[PDB]
Amino acid sequence: GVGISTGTFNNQTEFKFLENGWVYITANSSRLVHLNMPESENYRRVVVNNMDKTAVNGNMALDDIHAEIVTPWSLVDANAWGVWFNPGDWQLIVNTMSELHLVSFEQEIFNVVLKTVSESATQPPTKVYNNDLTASLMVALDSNNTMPFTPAAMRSETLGFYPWKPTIPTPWRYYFQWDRTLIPSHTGTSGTPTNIYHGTDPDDVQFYTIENSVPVHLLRTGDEFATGTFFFDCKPCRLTHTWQTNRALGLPPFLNSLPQSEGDTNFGDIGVQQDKRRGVTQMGNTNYITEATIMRPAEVGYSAPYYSFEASTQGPFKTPIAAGRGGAQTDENQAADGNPRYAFGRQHGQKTTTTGETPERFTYIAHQDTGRYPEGDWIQNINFNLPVTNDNVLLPTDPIGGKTGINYTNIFNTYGPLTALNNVPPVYPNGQIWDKEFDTDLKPRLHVNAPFVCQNNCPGQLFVKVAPNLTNQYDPDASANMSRIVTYSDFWWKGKLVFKAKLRASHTWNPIQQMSINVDNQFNYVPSNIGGMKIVYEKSQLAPRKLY
Amino acid sequence: TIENSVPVHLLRTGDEFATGTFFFDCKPCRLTHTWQTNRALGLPPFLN
Ligand SMILES: [Ca+2]
């Protein structure tokens, strides 16, 4: 079987329009993957300890210590938008559809190849690559999800984003329990705080091996591996955004006085004393019915502490925020809303002809207004009594704990039974698509890394590796790691991701926002005279929708 | 008052009281523990 192909390369995106404005979107993607043999054939238990950085008072946030198990296997991950759609497809989806559903997924490996490097050490010296028609590529598909879930998108180590550029997988490794203590401090702080790595707790040790828990497949050149189809069980994702905040819900006040001259500087007027109006309020001790005072059904969005690090058994970590963008973009407070920032390079969006190790990056700012503008907040004594007196107001300007740079908004939290929020929006092309759910008794209401969370089981991970190619002399009783013939593999990967979407219709007299090419961005969607490419990020929920 | 809201049974030496069977409707309880904190979720950083 050494002389014939076992597959077809396919990277077409098909749109199947069904009855009732429902679209069937089939995303074919295939790639050439290159794989080298492991540096070592054993599992290593390694600890990282950058105490040199955190030993400097006021550097707590740069903590990198952890323990991980380094495995001799590689992970083939394709969970990122860029792997399946090009800017052309994204425009069609984002401008036309109103919601997206994740249906099924499947992959395949074919046309496997294993070559061997012959070191013609002489003259230059030279190298020679020869096919080893009996060598084997090892393939393991963790279908029961025994292994820990490690989504490569998190560290931008997913499959490349160009159908015509070869790619590679990432070495697989997972976390291993450890106990760590780090006490906070600042520049002034005297002495040394407490920076200790206690070790490992016995009741939390879990050493996993692929050999012991998954059936391994041996593929030779004439072999091919296919996965069945997997059907997702997730909630639909909306491609629309809400714009109403608590201030724009319900019946506005009737204006007894209207403008008589064109110009947005000629205002209308309610025309009724603020303390003589009618309506409902949740302030029992006053008669002022203001647009900031009148009652609204519940609350859109919430306030959370910002640049807050909490600590537990293995060190400090940032407190996540699930928020939109409340606040005119020019003003914002991306910390308060927790906008994500993405760093990546060459293989996932950064200009292909660039040089150097500095990544490319961007901070995604959503369209939905479910965020907060802290500087606008304030708290006041119940006696009310305006104008409020300095002693009856806490401003995002008054210091807390004596600190001049810390607010109350800084540790404030207004999440409660009246809180309404929206899920996270897709992020093309660097975003992760789906995510496994936490196996805790009570689950989160959403995840901040991906729009689709598998309610049942997610698709298990696919691990690949080059089987050992031994020489004439091998001795099992040898501390010093043995010898293998330098071997590497090249194989084609192919996958299919099917979504189901719904076409939108016009409902307002005015046009809506739409993605479009133009004089300015034009050259971000075409190659350079040298063949340099790049994939600029786009936004997914242009197009408003009512909230209430 | 128990007298006003429940039927009272009088048992003498030769008497006996039995309850029927009652079937609970609760979520299962796990006899396992999790050890991962926010710091041990996902793909660790590749060590060069
Ligand atoms: Ca907006």
Side-chain angles (χ1 to χ4, degrees):
Chain A
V2 41
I4 64 171
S5 274
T6 54
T8 286
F9 177 109
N10 192 318
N11 216 291
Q12 304 181 87
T13 298
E14 310 158 9
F15 298 81
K16 187 177 180 183
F17 300 94
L18 305 346
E19 282 280 308
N20 270 84
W22 278 96
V23 193
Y24 200 40
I25 303 174
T26 301
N28 301 102
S29 168
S30 62
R31 226 124 288 191
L32 172 61
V33 189
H34 179 259
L35 175 71
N36 279 101
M37 75 183 146
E39 71 96 6
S40 170
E41 297 290 355
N42 319 128
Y43 287 77
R44 291 144 142 284
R45 193 187 84 242
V46 178
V47 171
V48 159
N49 180 162
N50 72 322
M51 227 147 61
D52 63 80
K53 276 296 179 302
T54 46
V56 170
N57 297 337
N59 277 329
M60 318 114 310
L62 304 183
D63 187 29
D64 268 345
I65 134 184
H66 68 278
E68 59 173 86
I69 278 187
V70 183
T71 78
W73 290 77
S74 300
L75 201 209
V76 175
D77 180 327
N79 192 354
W81 296 103
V83 178
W84 313 93
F85 300 117
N86 57 195
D89 297 323
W90 200 254
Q91 176 183 55
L92 181 61
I93 298 180
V94 161
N95 289 356
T96 309
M97 269 88 256
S98 74
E99 81 178 315
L100 198 62
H101 301 204
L102 183 62
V103 177
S104 59
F105 173 53
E106 56 147 321
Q107 331 169 57
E108 184 195 334
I109 291 181
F110 59 101
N111 279 221
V112 166
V113 170
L114 294 89
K115 282 173 180 294
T116 252
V117 185
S118 182
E119 192 46 272
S120 179
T122 198
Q123 312 294 185
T126 32
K127 276 189 162 186
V128 168
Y129 313 95
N130 322 78
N131 301 307
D132 187 332
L133 296 177
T134 62
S136 306
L137 174 71
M138 299 178 92
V139 176
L141 211 232
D142 180 27
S143 62
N144 297 72
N145 267 299
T146 291
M147 245 78 284
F149 195 64
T150 60
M154 181 187 172
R155 315 206 94 109
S156 186
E157 305 187 3
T158 205
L159 246 40
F161 296 171
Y162 301 105
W164 56 87
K165 181 177 185 181
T167 187
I168 62 175
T170 34
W172 192 57
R173 66 270 181 182
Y174 60 85
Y175 286 113
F176 186 97
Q177 207 282 332
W178 75 91
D179 222 303
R180 187 283 149 84
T181 289
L182 171 65
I183 290 180
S185 71
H186 60 74
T187 287
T189 299
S190 61
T192 40
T194 279
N195 191 311
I196 299 178
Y197 173 89
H198 304 89
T200 304
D201 307 306
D203 321 326
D204 298 336
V205 170
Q206 287 183 157
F207 174 30
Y208 289 113
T209 275
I210 283 183
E211 292 70 20
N212 295 89
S213 58
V214 188
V216 177
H217 295 284
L218 274 40
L219 311 198
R220 284 178 165 179
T221 296
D223 297 317
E224 174 252 8
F225 175 96
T227 267
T229 282
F230 178 103
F231 297 86
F232 294 94
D233 189 304
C234 315
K235 306 172 188 183
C237 173
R238 303 165 92 164
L239 289 170
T240 249
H241 79 267
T242 58
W243 66 260
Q244 277 157 290
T245 63
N246 261 239
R247 283 287 287 271
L249 303 174
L251 183 63
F254 175 92
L255 313 185
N256 292 89
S257 187
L258 291 179
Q260 288 179 294
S261 314
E262 269 197 352
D264 294 324
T265 39
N266 299 62
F267 309 131
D269 180 43
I270 298 176
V272 174
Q273 268 197 54
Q274 287 182 152
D275 53 40
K276 289 189 176 179
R277 295 175 180 176
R278 310 189 304 223
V280 190
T281 252
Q282 210 175 47
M283 301 185 83
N285 62 174
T286 59
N287 301 336
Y288 281 124
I289 292 176
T290 292
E291 277 293 298
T293 275
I294 199 171
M295 176 171 93
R296 310 288 173 172
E299 182 167 4
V300 179
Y302 70 105
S303 290
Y306 54 112
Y307 275 23
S308 151
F309 292 76
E310 306 181 64
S312 189
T313 312
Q314 32 237 20
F317 62 79
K318 225 274 282 193
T319 293
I321 304 290
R325 77 99 185 167
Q329 213 321 68
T330 282
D331 301 1
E332 23 60 70
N333 199 307
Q334 308 180 300
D337 300 334
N339 303 167
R341 194 172 165 63
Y342 290 75
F344 49 90
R346 230 68 62 56
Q347 187 161 48
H348 309 286
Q350 148 159 271
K351 192 176 205 170
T352 250
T353 53
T354 299
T355 227
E357 44 129 46
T358 302
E360 169 82 60
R361 36 203 163 194
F362 67 90
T363 291
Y364 191 89
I365 295 180
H367 275 296
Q368 79 194 339
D369 288 71
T370 52
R372 289 296 136 93
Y373 180 64
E375 302 78 0
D377 308 333
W378 86 79
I379 286 179
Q380 54 176 299
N381 187 293
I382 64 173
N383 290 304
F384 227 28
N385 290 319
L386 322 175
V388 66
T389 272
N390 183 64
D391 280 274
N392 309 93
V393 233
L394 191 59
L395 276 29
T397 249
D398 303 315
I400 287 298
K403 307 316 187 76
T404 276
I406 303 305
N407 280 34
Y408 80 81
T409 64
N410 263 124
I411 74 201
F412 200 45
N413 182 355
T414 50
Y415 183 69
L418 301 167
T419 290
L421 60 156
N422 300 320
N423 186 197
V424 160
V427 172
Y428 179 87
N430 306 281
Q432 168 174 166
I433 300 168
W434 65 85
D435 200 23
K436 164 178 178 182
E437 176 74 87
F438 288 1
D439 186 31
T440 57
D441 289 337
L442 309 188
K443 332 278 180 181
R445 303 179 79 189
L446 76 161
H447 284 208
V448 295
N449 54 134
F452 300 109
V453 176
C454 309
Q455 318 199 309
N456 307 160
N457 186 26
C458 259
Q461 323 198 83
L462 175 64
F463 309 95
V464 82
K465 159 183 175 180
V466 173
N469 206 358
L470 310 175
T471 63
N472 67 296
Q473 53 237 319
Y474 170 75
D475 182 40
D477 271 74
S479 51
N481 282 299
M482 45 69 112
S483 61
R484 311 169 286 172
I485 292 172
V486 169
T487 300
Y488 69 95
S489 173
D490 277 342
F491 58 86
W492 294 79
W493 172 81
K494 184 182 176 177
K496 172 189 290 179
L497 196 66
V498 171
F499 300 74
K500 181 144 302 169
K502 173 86 178 187
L503 292 164
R504 82 183 181 80
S506 178
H507 297 87
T508 56
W509 170 286
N510 61 88
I512 233 46
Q513 167 154 283
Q514 301 275 75
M515 173 181 150
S516 170
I517 200 174
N518 59 48
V519 159
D520 297 334
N521 57 205
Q522 176 176 56
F523 290 115
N524 291 157
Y525 310 99
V526 152
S528 64
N529 64 320
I530 277 184
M533 290 286 290
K534 84 161 87 167
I535 302 183
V536 176
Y537 89 87
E538 321 280 356
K539 291 186 176 186
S540 55
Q541 309 178 324
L542 4 165
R545 84 154 181 276
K546 315 194 299 289
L547 178 324
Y548 173 80
Chain B
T1 275
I2 283 183
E3 292 70 20
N4 295 89
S5 58
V6 188
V8 177
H9 295 284
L10 274 40
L11 311 198
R12 284 178 165 179
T13 296
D15 297 317
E16 174 252 8
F17 175 96
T19 267
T21 282
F22 178 103
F23 297 86
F24 294 94
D25 189 304
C26 315
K27 306 173 188 183
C29 173
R30 303 165 92 164
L31 289 170
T32 249
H33 79 267
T34 58
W35 66 260
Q36 277 157 290
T37 63
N38 261 239
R39 283 287 287 271
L41 303 174
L43 183 63
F46 175 92
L47 313 185
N48 292 89

